[PDB]
From a paper:
Upon RBPpb5 binding to [name], the central fiber reorganizes: The three FNIIIs strings dissociate, two strings relocate on one side of BHPpb3, and the third one on the other side. This reorganization of the central fiber is allowed by the long linker that connects BHPpb3 hdIV to the first FNIII and which now runs perpendicular to the tail axis along BHPpb3. The central fiber bends by ~160° at the level of the hinge between the third pb4 FNIII and pb4 spike: The latter is now surrounded and stabilized by pb4 FNIIIs, which interact with and stabilize pb4 spike small decoration domains. pb4 spike also undergoes structural rearrangement, with a different twist of the spike. This bending and stabilization of the central fiber bring the tail tube closer to the membrane, orient it correctly, and anchor the tail to the membrane. Upon RBPpb5 binding to [name], a constraint at the RBPpb5-pb4 interface occurs, resulting in the different twist of pb4 spike observed in its proximal part. This twisting of the spike would pull on pb4 FNIII-spike linker, leading to the disruption of the FNIII-spike interaction network. The association between this FNIII and the spike is thus loosened; the pb4 FNIII-spike linker reorganizes and stabilizes a new interaction network between the three FNIII strings and the spike. This series of events results in the bending of the central fiber, at the level of the FNIII-spike hinge, on the side of the tube, pulling the tube toward the host membrane. The map after interaction with the receptor contains the spike decoration domains and the FNIIIs while that before interaction contains only pb4 spike.
Author numbering:
A (entry chain f): 414 to 482
B (entry chain g): 414 to 469
C (entry chain e): 414 to 551, 562 to 688
D (entry chain g), E (entry chain f): 621 to 688
F (entry chain f), G (entry chain e): 1 to 207
Write the structure that this text describes.
Amino acid sequence: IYTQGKTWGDTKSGIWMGMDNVTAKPKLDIGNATQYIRYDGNILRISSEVVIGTPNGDIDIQTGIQGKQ
Amino acid sequence: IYTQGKTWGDTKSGIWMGMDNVTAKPKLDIGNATQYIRYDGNILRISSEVVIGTPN
Amino acid sequence: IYTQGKTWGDTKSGIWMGMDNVTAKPKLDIGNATQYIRYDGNILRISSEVVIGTPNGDIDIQTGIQGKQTVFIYIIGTSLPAKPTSPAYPPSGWSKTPPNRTSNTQNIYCSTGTLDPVTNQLVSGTSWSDVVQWSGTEQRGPGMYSLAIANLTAWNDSQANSFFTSNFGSGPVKYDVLTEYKSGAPGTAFTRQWNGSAWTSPAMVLHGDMIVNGTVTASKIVANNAFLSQIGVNIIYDRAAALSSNPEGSYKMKIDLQNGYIHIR
Amino acid sequence: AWTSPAMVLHGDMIVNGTVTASKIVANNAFLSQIGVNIIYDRAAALSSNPEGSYKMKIDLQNGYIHIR
Amino acid sequence: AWTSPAMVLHGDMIVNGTVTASKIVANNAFLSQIGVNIIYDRAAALSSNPEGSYKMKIDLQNGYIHIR
Amino acid sequence: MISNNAPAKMVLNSVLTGYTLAYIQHSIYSDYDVIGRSFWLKEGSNVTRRDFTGIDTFSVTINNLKPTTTYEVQGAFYDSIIDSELLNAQIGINLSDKQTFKMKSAPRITGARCESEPVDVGVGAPIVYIDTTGEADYCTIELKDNSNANNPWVKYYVGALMPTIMFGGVPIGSYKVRISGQISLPDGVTIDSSGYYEYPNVFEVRY
Amino acid sequence: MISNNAPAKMVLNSVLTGYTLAYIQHSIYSDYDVIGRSFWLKEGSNVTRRDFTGIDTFSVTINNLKPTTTYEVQGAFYDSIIDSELLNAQIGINLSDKQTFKMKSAPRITGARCESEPVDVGVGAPIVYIDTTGEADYCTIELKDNSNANNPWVKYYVGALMPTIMFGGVPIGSYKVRISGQISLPDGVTIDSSGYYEYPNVFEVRY
């Protein structure tokens, strides 16, 4: 499944997802030439900056936090 | 491609993946309103904790 | 949407992405049985090692970057001098080469820190080494490295070994890491750290900088520099003794645990 | 109590740049240059009051070694 | 200049293996064994030319300790 | 009979050349008192003696050079018995053999246009065509929106330099394309980056 | 006063091993009368002498070596004074100390197989699973349809040698498989390949 005129490991700005019978491994690519999330069965590469979680993800709901000197 | 009644910024839990002619950047969103993988065209955001590799 | 036959978390290679009506949580599964990126509604698992960022991603395009080391012997001195304070490759009225001396005088050198060719002066920090009288003639700290390959398809142990034995002429040391990228495509790259014998690819690689609002735990940490406000440790060896000699026979160590003392050796 | 971390690595990690964190815990640290103000014993540092530590290479202000 | 990193986290980090980086910054550290070539004071290490201005230095390689 | 033999003649491998930079891999010394290395650059009738006193590594890089100029490099290890004046006079040392090399040319762009992707149905997405001439590898290409003078420069391609370079993901509008190729060297951290050679002509991309 | 000097014994800086070619980095000669350099390999049972004309470069490439055979390297420069008979006697040569290295092993295929998933609708895509036992840095795999008397060998997989190799996109005819390993010499251009090892069995691609 992909956007029309898009191929994996290509400079186009489409999405590609499917089974690569040539290497018999699944493939993936979301993004333009520079910023992309490209995955090959052997290895995954994420060009763009990545953020995990959110600020105050594990903050106590009943009580906040604070600091003083 | 998306589950019915879903948008990249909706609070509904669902899957949304496709282009955006406004920026020509692919956009991907998968998860609920508090546990999700929001891939903006420029930055990849993950809410739920992630495990990399397997022990031994 | 899924390849025929594949199901979420199934052994056969394929992909799967869709809804879990009962749990009302999106699910995704991509990859083989051994390697896969599986995301349930509460956890994201990636078996295959992941590389985030690209080599030389955040470099200055106006000006490159390079590193160099210098060591100059620079006094016709009767007595041991005080080490230079000006960070200039020719220090304050200080020669760059061993001059001629009179019988009474002697020669003193300094293991100058890393030099920056672009600025032609000591990089910020890394002041001059202790001055030692030059008598006759004057392991290396593991560091990060990168190499360019004309046409790269996979990691090349032979190329890395040739690289180290060519540049440094001594082979890699433990904890060394070299990243190899295809010339004309920095996106495709392979990174491996040399420990013991041969190279072992790490489970994850980052090319820029890592920022963590919380804590970090690891079996061991190696870095060329550190700035810690408060540090708590039981034992502290010397780097060479710590890594080079497992028995830690030779040392110059402090011992916070048990009896606390200072040993010079 | 128990808690779930942000993300877990079951193998080693390589970072070509600098890594910043609120606090670090590890067994073995093989560095080449460290800038530290005050150092206590591992147990003493983990303690509520580090004043009872065995040794202190205080450097920010005092700059003296005191062994308890 | 303000610089965008490669990784951002907000919970905690776990690494079964080892983590390597060019340099490290952290407010606190709880370690067991350390092998280091040289130890400085944070104020000196952050400042350029640390050995020009350093409250206390120890050179483990050269077996030397200095207090001003 | 006691003596201090001079270092053996320095042997240089192929000169890896990047604009304003160089890389020379030489042999390994064997004398017991080798303390420094030097090279005599020769540009036209001008000779520059670049000296490196660091013996730790066996690769060297000249930080500063003149773009697109054939040079001549002669290197030599020198003992402690060689002084600054003696080294300047090239007396008492074994100099390397002559070697000729030429510098590289920064990438330059010839044209820029918007073309619609050939498709079997629907409105094919635009793809930007730019023709590139120069010498580099994985040259980076950027863009700037022409609506305002403060718009950021956005990278869009770092792939290998080709006579014709194509890429997508460009929003409809008018942009000024900027290129500055890169070329690395075997050395671990030496990377060469040219200046920015932006296209004088503004071009617009549309469906 | 007049005297003769034997070439200074060289030091073998390093040796990179190929299962057919050997790369050695050695110091540079320092005596004027030097005319050539020679080496004395040791198979462990028979001693083999190899010499290369010219002393321009610091590296050498010993060819025609028995794979999977450790060797010992010792050699030095011989000047015009040294004679062929005297060189064979190795009396005045003052050769370098010996050094032992292990010579790598060529790739081989442990087994050949092909399996594919049954499919409800459509056709199962053929795939080839082949398990190797080599140690080459990266290996290429060829194929040839054996049903016809003569067919040209065709490359289908290029990549790192692995315990198990997976590839697809191959036609239906029965095939014969040969596997070769290629290891890059320190010089980028030169690459040392292997004698093609072929699986005696011949199999149809799993359709």
